[PDB]
Amino acid sequence: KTFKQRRTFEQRVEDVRLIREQHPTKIPVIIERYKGEKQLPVLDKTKFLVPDHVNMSELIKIIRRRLQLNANQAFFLLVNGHSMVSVSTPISEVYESEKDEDGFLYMVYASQETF
Ligand SMILES: NC(=S)Nc1ccccc1OC(F)(F)F
Ligand SMILES: [Cl-]
């Protein structure tokens, strides 16, 4: 069901290596709906190439636009299992400290801050 489940550590590593080769300026991001989530829809896909200059605040806006949410629907985004300490950090910086050992940056979203 979840991404890590569907692809071997070997396969995830090689896809990150291909994104480096073909999209050197993009951060490889996995974005998944919390398996408990009731309100928010599921995304059209799982794997995103994010321009390395966008900050977490702009990534949240991007995903809210992708889900086509409205002003008073809630949205929380966990990175590498935990709350973001700041939304102003460039995703290049966030990647370097929060990346998985496979090379992806893992994110999960929910309507509840209590995931
Ligand atoms: N659409 C995605 S997933 N990423 C993206 C972002 C900005 C420009 C182009 C993009 O696609 C590309 F990475 F495939 F090039
Ligand atoms: Cl590129």
Swiss-Prot record:
The membrane topology noted for this protein in its Swiss-Prot or TrEMBL record is: Lipid-anchor
Q: Which organism is it from?
A: Homo sapiens
One BP term from GO: cellular response to nitrogen starvation
Q: What is the lineage of its organism?
A: Eukaryota, Metazoa, Chordata, Craniata, Vertebrata
What Gene3D superfamilies does its record include?
A: Phosphatidylinositol 3-kinase Catalytic Subunit, Chain A, domain 1
UniProt key word DNA repair:
no
What is the protein name for this chain?
Microtubule-associated protein 1 light chain 3 beta
Q: What is the effect of changing residue 64 to A?
A: Impairs cleavage by ATG4B
Q: What does this protein do?
A: Ubiquitin-like modifier involved in formation of autophagosomal vacuoles (autophagosomes). Plays a role in mitophagy which contributes to regulate mitochondrial quantity and quality by eliminating the mitochondria to a basal level to fulfill cellular energy requirements and preventing excess ROS production.
